[PDB]
Structures are given as C-alpha cells and as structure tokens.
Amino acid sequence: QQEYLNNNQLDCDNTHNSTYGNVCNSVTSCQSYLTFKSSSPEYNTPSSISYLLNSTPSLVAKSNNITDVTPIITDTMVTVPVTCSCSGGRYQHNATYNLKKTGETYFSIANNTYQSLTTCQALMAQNPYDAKNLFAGDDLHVPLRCACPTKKQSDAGFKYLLTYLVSQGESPDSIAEIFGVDTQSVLDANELDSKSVVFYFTPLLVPLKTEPPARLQIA
Numbered sequence: 001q002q003e004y005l006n007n008n009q010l011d012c013d014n015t016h017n018s019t020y021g022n023v024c025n026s027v028t029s030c031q032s033y034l035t036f037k038s039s040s041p042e043y044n045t046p047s048s049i050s051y052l053l054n055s056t057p058s059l060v061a062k063s064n065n066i067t068d069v070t071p072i073i074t075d076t077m078v079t080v081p082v083t084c085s086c087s088g089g090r091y092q093h094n095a096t097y098n099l100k101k102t103g104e105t106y107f108s109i110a111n112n113t114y115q116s117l118t119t120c121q122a123l124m125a126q127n128p129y130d131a132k133n134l135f136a137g138d139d140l141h142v143p144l145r146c147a148c149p150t151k152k153q154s155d156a157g158f159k160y161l162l163t164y165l166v167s168q169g170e171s172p173d174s175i176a177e178i179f180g181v182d183t184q185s186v187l188d189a190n191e192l193d194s195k196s197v198v199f200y201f202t203p204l205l206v207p208l209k210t211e212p213p214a215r216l217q218i219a
C-alpha cells in the first residue's frame with residue numbers, strides 16, 4: 001500500500017508526505033508500469049514517449065502490441081514499462097527534461113507535460129532552481145511516480161504495480177475492471193476505502209496479477 005495523493009499536488013505550497021513520491025516499503029527494485037496519453041505532435045510515437053519518460057521504444061512497442069515507430073492516435077493511453085527503484089526513501093523512476101521555452105513552470109511540467117506522472121513538490125525537492133527562476137534550457141531531474149509491491153501484495157499474487165492516469169468519469173471499480181482485479185485491491189494499494197473520493201488528473205496505483213493488457217480502452 002501507498003498513500004494517495006488526494007490532489008495535494010495541485011498546490012505547490014503543500015508539503016504533504018505523499019507529494020514527494022511513493023515510499024520505499026518493499027524490495028529495492030522491480031519492474032513497474034506507467035501510463036501516458038499520446039499527445040500530438042511532440043509525444044505521439046514510441047521514440048518521443050520513451051524519450052520523455054526514460055523507457056525504451058521497444059518496451060513501449062511490445063507493451064502496447066505496436067511497432068517501435070508506430071504513431072499513436074492522440075488521447076490513447078499507452079503502458080510504459082519502467083524500472084522502479086528506491087532512492088532516498090522514495091520509489092521513483094528517474095527521467096530527465098530540458099525546458100523547451102521560458103514560461104514553463106514546475107507545475108506545468110508536472111501536471112501538463114508529464115500528465116501528473118510527477119509532482120512539483122518532487123521536482124522542486126530534486127532540482128536546484130527556484131520555482132520562479134526557470135529558463136529555457138534548464139535540465140531537470142524528473143522523479144516519476146512508481147512503486148514496488150509489498151510482501152503482502154506479493155503474497156496475494158500481485159507481480160507488478162501500475163501507475164494509472166485517472167480521467168474524468170472513472171472509479172476504482174471501473175479501473176479495476178480494466179485489469180481484472182478486485183476493486184478492493186485497488187483501494188488497498190492507495191490506502192483508500194469504499195467511500196473515498198478519486199480525482200481525475202491524479203495518478204492511482206493499480207496492482208496487477210499479470211502484465212497489463214496491450215490496449216486499454218474506456219477510461
């Protein structure tokens with residue numbers, strides 16, 4: 001189980017424990033998965049998606065049953081296999097990002113470009129620049145949110161945890177349907193309960209008993 005972000009990442013003055021990333025409460029490394037909505041014209045191929053998220057064009061390719069140069073239709077959610085490793089007491093997958101234009105912010109990079117796969121808190125915590133002091137050409141360490149299954153999750157038969165990008169209209173029940181798991185199991189992984197509220201544009205952990213489906217459909 002990991003703590004749920006609970007929209008604490010939309011206010012870059014918030015300092016909650018969860019905004020700095022998932023907590024290293026299990027094995028030191030593991031295979032994990034991210035999700036990412038294809039965006040044209042900059043991030044709609046395996047090369048550019050894996051360049052942004054620091055994966056590999058063929059892992060993206062095999063994970064979605066496409067070729068490593070297949071253009072992905074805009075707004076399609078694709079799975080991105082990434083190595084998750086403990087770092088300073090946090091689970092993360094290290095990636096790098098050059099600011100393309102002066103005017104981008106830690107929040108715009110976190111919520112817009114990376115689609116809430118990281119937080120401005122984690123970006124600020126792991127980069128030297130002050131928030132109001134960013135210029136085109138600055139090179140940022142990007143800690144992407146991932147986690148490794150706990151011994152309790154591994155005992156229940158979960159091999160991977162997946163970071164899911166929640167869209168408007170979904171529920172822990174409809175998301176768990178995509179991956180064929182108990183709606184409960186999704187609530188455990190994010191330390192939620194039956195009455196808990198799940199916001200869109202906020203990443204959610206999904207425990208997987210097998211590899212994710214090649215094509216995620218209705219979200």
Ligand SMILES: CC(=O)N[C@@H]1[C@@H](O)[C@H](O[C@@H]2O[C@H](CO)[C@@H](O[C@@H]3O[C@H](CO)[C@@H](O[C@@H]4O[C@H](CO)[C@@H](O[C@@H]5O[C@H](CO)[C@@H](O[C@@H]6O[C@H](CO)[C@@H](O[C@@H]7O[C@H](CO)[C@@H](O[C@@H]8O[C@H](CO)[C@@H](O)[C@H](O)[C@H]8NC(C)=O)[C@H](O)[C@H]7NC(C)=O)[C@H](O)[C@H]6NC(C)=O)[C@H](O)[C@H]5NC(C)=O)[C@H](O)[C@H]4NC(C)=O)[C@H](O)[C@H]3NC(C)=O)[C@H](O)[C@H]2NC(C)=O)[C@@H](CO)O[C@H]1O
Pocket residue numbers: 007008009010011012013103104105106107108120131132133134135166167168169170171172196197198199200201
């Ligand atoms: C039948 C049934 O029951 N079904 C169930 C379903 O209903 C259920 O589905 C759920 O239903 C829920 C109920 O409807 C629903 O909940 C709602 O969810 C909404 C979406 O999350 C949510 O709306 C939220 O609300 C929040 C809270 O208020 C809002 O948050 C605010 O957002 C603002 C922007 O939008 C934020 O602001 C920005 O802040 C950042 C950082 O602080 C700031 O960035 C800085 O900017 C400055 C200025 O520019 C930068 O400075 C510049 O820097 C550059 C670069 O160097 C310099 O060059 C430059 O000079 C310099 N300028 C200057 C002047 O100096 C600086 O760098 C930046 N800093 C950094 C670090 O980057 C921005 O500027 C700010 N922007 C602005 C415009 O001000 C603000 O912080 C933030 N507030 C807080 C407190 O966080 C959200 O916006 C809002 N979002 C939207 C989209 O509306 C609702 O509130 C929820 N409602 C309720 C009731 O809870 C669920 O979503 C829904 N889920 C789903 C999946 O649908 C399901 C699930 O349970 O279950 C079914 O069963």
Ligand SMILES: *[C@@H]1O[C@H](CO)[C@@H](O[C@@H]2O[C@H](CO)[C@@H](O[C@@H]3O[C@H](CO)[C@@H](O)[C@H](O)[C@@H]3O)[C@H](O)[C@H]2NC(C)=O)[C@H](O)[C@H]1NC(C)=O
Pocket residue numbers: 010111112115201
């Ligand atoms: C978090 O990032 C999301 C996107 O990842 C931001 O949501 C996007 O917000 C804009 C406007 O705020 C939405 O529309 C845009 O503006 C106009 C009006 O619709 C339109 O002409 C443009 O094409 C553009 O889409 C946009 O649809 C919306 N994206 C999604 C997926 O809903 C969001 O503002 C960011 N911030 C927060 C605090 O959530």
Ligand SMILES: *[C@@H]1O[C@H](CO[C@@H]2O[C@@H](C)[C@@H](O)[C@@H](O)[C@@H]2O)[C@@H](O[C@@H]2O[C@H](CO)[C@@H](O)[C@H](O)[C@H]2NC(C)=O)[C@H](O)[C@H]1NC(C)=O
Pocket residue numbers: 001002003017023024025191
């Ligand atoms: C941030 O949280 C971690 C662990 O996450 C939480 O831990 C529990 C307190 C509970 O809220 C769980 O649901 C969360 O997952 C904190 O580390 C733990 O600290 C406690 C208390 O000292 C200790 O018993 C645990 O063994 C620690 N676990 C781990 C994995 O380190 C951590 O201290 C918090 N950090 C900050 C800065 O708030």
Ligand SMILES: *[C@@H]1O[C@H](CO)[C@@H](O[C@@H]2O[C@H](CO)[C@@H](O)[C@H](O)[C@H]2NC(C)=O)[C@H](O)[C@H]1NC(C)=O
Pocket residue numbers: 065066067214
């Ligand atoms: C992607 O999707 C499925 C496996 O998930 C494969 O579907 C086959 O598609 C070919 C045409 O490309 C058909 O001739 C086969 O009959 C299909 N088989 C089934 C069982 O549906 C497909 O091969 C995969 N890979 C691609 C398109 O490269």
Ligand SMILES: *[C@@H]1O[C@H](CO)[C@@H](O[C@@H]2O[C@H](CO)[C@@H](O)[C@H](O)[C@H]2NC(C)=O)[C@H](O)[C@H]1NC(C)=O
Pocket residue numbers: 085087088094125126127141142143
């Ligand atoms: C992932 O990146 C972080 C930084 O974003 C690395 O953490 C640094 O680790 C070195 C030694 O390994 C320390 O001297 C630095 O102070 C650390 N910085 C921060 C901000 O934590 C981490 O090592 C990287 N992990 C991997 C696996 O590459």
